[PDB]
Design a binder for these strands. Structure first.
Ligand code: CA
Ligand code: CA
Ligand code: MG
Ligand code: MG
Ligand code: MG
Ligand code: MG
Ligand code: MG
Ligand code: MG
Ligand code: MG
Ligand code: MG
Ligand code: MG
Ligand code: MG
Ligand code: MG
Ligand code: MG
Ligand code: MG
Ligand code: MG
Ligand code: MG
Ligand code: MG
Ligand code: MG
Ligand code: MG
Ligand code: MG
Ligand code: MG
Ligand code: MG
Ligand code: MG
Ligand code: MG
Ligand code: MG
Ligand code: MG
Ligand code: MG
Ligand code: MG
Ligand code: MG
Ligand code: MG
Ligand code: MG
Ligand code: MG
Ligand code: MG
Ligand code: MG
Ligand code: MG
Ligand code: MG
Ligand code: MG
Ligand code: MG
Ligand code: MG
Ligand code: MG
Ligand code: MG
Ligand code: MG
Ligand code: MG
Ligand code: MG
Ligand code: MG
Ligand code: MG
Ligand code: MG
Ligand code: MG
Ligand code: MG
Ligand code: MG
Ligand code: MG
Ligand code: MG
Ligand code: MG
Ligand code: MG
Ligand code: MG
Ligand code: MG
Ligand code: MG
Ligand code: MG
Ligand code: MG
Ligand code: MG
Ligand code: MG
Ligand code: MG
Ligand code: MG
Ligand code: MG
Ligand code: MG
Ligand code: MG
Ligand code: MG
Ligand code: MG
Ligand code: MG
Ligand code: MG
Ligand code: MG
Ligand code: MG
Lengths: 117, 115, 57, 129
RNA sequence: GGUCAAGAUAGUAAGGGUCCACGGUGGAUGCCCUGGCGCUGGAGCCGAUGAAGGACGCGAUUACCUGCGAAAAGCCCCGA
RNA sequence: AAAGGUGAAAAGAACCCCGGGAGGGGAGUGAAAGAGAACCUGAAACCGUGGACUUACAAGCAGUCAUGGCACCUUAUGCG
RNA sequence: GCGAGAGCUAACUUCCGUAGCCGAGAGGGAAACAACCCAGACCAUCAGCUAAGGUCCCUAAAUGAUCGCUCAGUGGUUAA
RNA sequence: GUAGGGGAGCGUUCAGUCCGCGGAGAAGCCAUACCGGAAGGAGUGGUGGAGCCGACUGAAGUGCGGAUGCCGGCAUGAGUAACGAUAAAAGAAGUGAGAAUCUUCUUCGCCGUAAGGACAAGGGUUCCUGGGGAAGGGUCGUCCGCCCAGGGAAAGUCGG
């Protein structure tokens, strides 16, 4: 019994090719560059996911001291003074509190400063 | 460069661009008008036009000057006896060009030269 | 000696050479004497006029 | 309006091609014929007959004979009125390709591609608008 | 509202890109058999009575193949 | 060396239209001409036409992740 | 890196010993950078703490507090 | 986690058995936002027009991105280089769907111990006539050494 490759290879190739949407040029049309681009793209997808965690970390922080200094203290002497205010621990995305309710972020500034005295 | 040269190479050497303009001049005067490439008609004009001013001389000298460019004795007599005397009123406008269509083998605009 | 091209040209890059291969439409005009079709400073090919008849057609 | 299946529809309705003719296997290079066809495209069908007698390209002849056939079918078969007609679509595609060996220096041949064209035109009334 | 100043910001595509829709080219894939492959088993020499293999011919019209051989796509006898 | 396929049946396209033709568009036949003799299917590379979103201060292994814009709504109003 | 020979107490040299890394080791730092510093990636999270290394703006985080030092851009290139 | 060892599996053809499906439409092809831990598998729609899925077992020519790998198709270079001796060509007239290129006329230029003529080798109808215009002709083509048909080839003394 002979068992030629037919239908198998086209199906595999077409699944690779379909992963290529708006890939530029022969990235979208030739199988070999499509598959090769996907190897490097693997690298990027995994690394980036882990990194995106750390990137939103950064955006968080960068808003929080901007509001903090608007109230006359930096990030450092703030997220300290909430933690030194101990039970105050809300921590996760204080960014949004600073970015939408300033009546609240002002009270948190007063709390941190009271804790540092 | 050529800041004041007059005339055309017609993608032809010295010997030929004369034997052209002589042969074409012989046909215009033998035919009244001919149809040729627009460029050869632009160069053909002043040569034939001067040549018939030579024939406006009447005398034997002008006849033999015309003969050295036009080697068919009949056309020589036509210009010498028929046309030039007809033009003896005419401060040199002896030729016009119309340009007809554009041909198909080589795509060259062509034109009429007439009297 | 013998220069030869280095990579194949991309469809994008070659098509943007050809950005300048557009033919110019003839500027056609209406013969005042014939019916229509005429090219400027030329005879009308149909009727032969260029103020009266010129060429035979 | 809605049919029982596809065997259905092949009996009940016949596909037809209003305003369309095509010259297949015309022995010319498609990118050339495309230069002149692009000059036609979207013009009022009279102008297209007018522009093509003065365009000085060799392709104008086959391209015009297709345009006349499109004008003809729109009138004789499709019963359109011809002072409305204009070239809604026109477009040239590859044909087969004749090939010959042509000897070159030192012994080697090359293959040379005599390319054909499928030139097609599709006229329609300007009663769009 | 209109000039004047300062500032900001849209649309144009010569041609390009991604996607979609529609075709062209081209002959993969599926289906098919007129063609092959092997094993098994039969059968196994032909020629001076001209072998094997060819050449030239034989048709109303015949270039190729097939059949035939100046009696030449056939002639005689027998059986179905 | 390459070698293949109308249709069940040739019913193998009378007639008309543009064209010197080639080619096509109709009318007919046929279940189908979404089978028409460059005649089963007809992938991909390659060539085009149309449309959506885009692009003429930009440095680019062509992706990846994040967010805004504009389209769209048949495993589909969503973590699209 | 340490301990030695060969070498000029040269070499991103060569040859043994010894520890660790790369080889087969991704991640953070060292501008970039296999070997150096921190640390060994089962998968997901728009949650929190630290290591090396950092906290003027590119660029996450003290234009930090207290004593001094250098007025050379030393910092940000050797010596007799 | 590289060579390497081990484990469990996905998909392809063929065979046996089962369960079945198919012109109210099969395989193949095409789109897709569903599913499974992966190989993969289903749903629905479009195409096609005659075969085929699922399960269990068995046997393999059984899984491609590479090999300056093979066959085939198609691209890039690109409307680029060239269009094969620097012995020129011009006008009129004709034929034709169509003419710079075919026919005619009249000139011009080129060979002339040749680029004229007669034979031998070799080629094999290329010869003439009438037609043609796909391809061949480096462009065109109404023409051709191309294609179709019909004719033409005569020896006692020439050569054997
Ligand atoms: Ca050019
Ligand atoms: Ca070039
Ligand atoms: Mg990354
Ligand atoms: Mg935090
Ligand atoms: Mg000079
Ligand atoms: Mg020249
Ligand atoms: Mg005359
Ligand atoms: Mg004078
Ligand atoms: Mg003189
Ligand atoms: Mg050199
Ligand atoms: Mg040779
Ligand atoms: Mg444009
Ligand atoms: Mg093709
Ligand atoms: Mg099949
Ligand atoms: Mg058999
Ligand atoms: Mg025999
Ligand atoms: Mg016979
Ligand atoms: Mg025979
Ligand atoms: Mg006998
Ligand atoms: Mg009998
Ligand atoms: Mg059949
Ligand atoms: Mg045809
Ligand atoms: Mg026909
Ligand atoms: Mg019917
Ligand atoms: Mg069809
Ligand atoms: Mg079909
Ligand atoms: Mg055909
Ligand atoms: Mg069938
Ligand atoms: Mg087909
Ligand atoms: Mg287009
Ligand atoms: Mg487009
Ligand atoms: Mg600028
Ligand atoms: Mg810009
Ligand atoms: Mg650039
Ligand atoms: Mg020493
Ligand atoms: Mg070393
Ligand atoms: Mg190694
Ligand atoms: Mg290791
Ligand atoms: Mg590392
Ligand atoms: Mg690192
Ligand atoms: Mg870095
Ligand atoms: Mg460094
Ligand atoms: Mg290094
Ligand atoms: Mg590494
Ligand atoms: Mg911390
Ligand atoms: Mg520390
Ligand atoms: Mg900062
Ligand atoms: Mg300080
Ligand atoms: Mg069906
Ligand atoms: Mg699927
Ligand atoms: Mg059937
Ligand atoms: Mg194998
Ligand atoms: Mg490999
Ligand atoms: Mg390969
Ligand atoms: Mg190849
Ligand atoms: Mg040359
Ligand atoms: Mg002539
Ligand atoms: Mg005539
Ligand atoms: Mg023609
Ligand atoms: Mg010539
Ligand atoms: Mg001739
Ligand atoms: Mg005559
Ligand atoms: Mg001779
Ligand atoms: Mg002979
Ligand atoms: Mg003979
Ligand atoms: Mg002859
Ligand atoms: Mg003759
Ligand atoms: Mg003949
Ligand atoms: Mg021809
Ligand atoms: Mg033929
Ligand atoms: Mg030709
Ligand atoms: Mg005699
Ligand atoms: Mg003798």
């Amino acid at each position: 019994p002979r068992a030629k490759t037919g239908i198998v290879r086209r199906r595999r190739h077409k699944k690779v090719l379909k992963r290529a949407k708006g890939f530029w040029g022969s990235r979208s049309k030739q199988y070999r560059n499509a598959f090769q681009t996907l190897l490097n793209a693997a690298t990027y997808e995994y690394r980036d996911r882990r990194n995106k965690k750390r990137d939103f970390r950064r955006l968080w922080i960068q808003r929080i001291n901007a509001g903090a200094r608007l109230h006359g203290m930096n990030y450092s002497t703030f997220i300290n003074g909430l933690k030194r205010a101990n039970i105050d621990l809300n921590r996760k995305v204080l960014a949004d509190i600073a970015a939408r309710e300033p009546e609240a972020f002002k009270a948190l500034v007063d709390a941190s400063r009271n804790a540092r005295q | 460069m050529r800041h004041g040269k007059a005339g055309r190479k017609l993608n032809r050497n010295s010997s030929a661009r004369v034997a052209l303009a002589r042969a074409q001049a012989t046909a215009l005067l033998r035919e009244g008008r001919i149809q040729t490439t627009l460029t050869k008609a632009k160069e053909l004009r002043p040569f034939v036009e001067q040549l018939i001013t030579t024939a406006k001389g009447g005398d034997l000298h002008s006849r033999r000057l015309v003969a050295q460019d036009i080697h068919d004795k009949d056309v020589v007599r036509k210009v010498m006896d028929e046309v030039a005397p007809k033009y003896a009123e005419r401060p040199g406008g002896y030729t016009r060009i119309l340009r007809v269509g554009t041909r198909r083998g080589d795509g060259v605009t062509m034109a009429l030269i007439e009297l | 000696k013998h220069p030869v091209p280095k990579k194949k040209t991309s469809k994008s890059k070659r098509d943007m050479r050809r950005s300048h291969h557009a033919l110019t439409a003839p500027n056609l005009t209406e013969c005042p004497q014939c019916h229509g079709k005429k090219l400027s400073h030329h005879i009308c090919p149909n009727c032969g006029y260029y103020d009266g008849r010129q060429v035979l057609a | 309006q809605t049919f029982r299946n596809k065997k259905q529809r092949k009996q009940q309705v016949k596909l037809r091609k209003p305003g369309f003719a095509v010259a297949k296997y015309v022995r010319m290079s498609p990118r050339k014929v495309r230069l002149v066809v692009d000059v036609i495209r979207g013009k009022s069908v009279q102008d297209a007959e007018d522009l093509l007698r003065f365009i000085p390209r060799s392709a104008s002849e086959p391209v015009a004979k297709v345009l006349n056939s499109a004008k003809a079918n729109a009138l004789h078969n499709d019963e359109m009125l011809e002072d409305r007609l204009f070239v809604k679509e026109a477009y040239v595609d590859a044909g087969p390709t004749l090939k010959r060996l042509i000897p070159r220096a030192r012994g080697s041949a090359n293959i040379i591609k005599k390319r054909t064209s499928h030139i097609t035109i599709i006229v329609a009334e300007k009663g769009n608008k």
